[PDB]
Design a protein around this ligand. Sequence first.
Ligand SMILES: [Fe+3]
Ligand SMILES: [Fe+3]
Ligand SMILES: [Fe+3]
Ligand SMILES: [Fe+3]
Ligand SMILES: [O-]
Ligand SMILES: [O-]
Lengths: 267, 268
Amino acid sequence: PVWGHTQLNRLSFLETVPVVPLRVSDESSEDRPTWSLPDIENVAITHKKPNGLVDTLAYRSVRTCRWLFDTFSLYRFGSITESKVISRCLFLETVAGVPGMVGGMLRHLSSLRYMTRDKGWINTLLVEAENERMHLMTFIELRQPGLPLRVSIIITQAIMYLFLLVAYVISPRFVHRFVGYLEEEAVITYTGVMRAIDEGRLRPTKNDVPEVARVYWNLSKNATFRDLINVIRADEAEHRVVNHTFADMHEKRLQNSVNPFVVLKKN
Amino acid sequence: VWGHTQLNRLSFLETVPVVPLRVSDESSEDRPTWSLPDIENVAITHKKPNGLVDTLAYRSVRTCRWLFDTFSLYRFGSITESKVISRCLFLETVAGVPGMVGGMLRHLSSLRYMTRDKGWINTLLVEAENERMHLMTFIELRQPGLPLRVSIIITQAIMYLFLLVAYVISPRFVHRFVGYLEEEAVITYTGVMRAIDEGRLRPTKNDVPEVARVYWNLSKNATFRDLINVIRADEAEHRVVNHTFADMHEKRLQNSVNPFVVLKKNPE
Ligand SMILES: [Fe+3]
Ligand SMILES: [Fe+3]
Ligand SMILES: [Fe+3]
Ligand SMILES: [Fe+3]
Ligand SMILES: [O-]
Ligand SMILES: [O-]
């Protein structure tokens, strides 16, 4: 049919690389977010009681990082403006899609060497990674950064990929918690923004939507900036739940159980 | 419903006891769709190398193939069904590792360069899945002894590490190594089918595991050979994708679109 032994039997397809269209659909797997704007309009700020040494430590530290990234970002002194907004979120998103990758592949590597059913935790992480990496590809179209923060970005990732690698190895409960808490704040970040556009204390100017984003979230032809944040928000909020649950499941020794969220595909 | 409701919950921990163990959820919905009498004719090819790098990959595949078949005493002994099943149980545990660094290193770069990737990552990923869906399938035909169970852990450390540092240095080398790897895979799985067909091997196992039913999509009637035939297809799917990839690299096209996104679909 479309794809069979005749292709399979050919040494290379290097000839067709000049002659395939860049599709913006091709930028992500076929696993897209598909919220309904009026609904995810209601997504709320939540908080989960830290349930021990680790949960609190995950909490504490996430909260000093916001402190230290808030002062250093300078995000602190001035208005909520599309600039230091896109600029902020953009940066965060470089780190935002790291945990999902290092988790998924660690579970992949367990599975492979101990020959066990992963029961679908892999893929759910591997999407969080892609999903945020997409969040990136969006923002990296509203406003490219400058050399100063392009560097900063490439040094942060170096540092973060050790932290998450070693920690995810030491305590996955710690990391899913750690991440749980970075989400809650991802909500707050974005949700406070939706409230600027609402209150008019910020007047968006990128009110089309990057084509990348528009297909991804099946966004309408002249969907506005706000609409965009609402899904970017929903996305995040889902990551919230999941990463506290995955952690709660580690809490009660369940890191080798069926992944709840597979079920919630039209169950 | 997957609405702000469930998004606003704290945790769904409490929900595990109710959710079923649906074999269909081990993998992503991205499933090799082969048509068997079609794929049947999957041939054994041999890509000519260019670089010294290609040469190297080729020797390092040869060398490991000799190493393995010897220390595994797979060469002689009246070829058994339960040494095919084992050798693939081991080999698909290494197999499931490069595609996964593959997709990981590329992944990270899209985020540190805030650049597009153009369909590479999800391909390299689902490979690492596909090679894992072999492993979970084989395990059902035979559980590894403690010798073997030990072998796979030690080997994961050598390999992973090796891949990881070859990936940073020579992406070309990895893609072409895998290519050549899979040129062997495809040799062996047609060997098996051939061996089966001349009744040199009589397949005691004909309960095709559920996992390989739902994942590959196959009637409850699909014989042992039917499995070998689909798996072997993927192995050749991997053989020419990674071999396209090594070529793509060698031609500074790392950042060109990944062609196989379109050869999913109909025309260009
Ligand atoms: Fe994010
Ligand atoms: Fe996030
Ligand atoms: Fe394989
Ligand atoms: Fe393979
Ligand atoms: O975020
Ligand atoms: O293989």
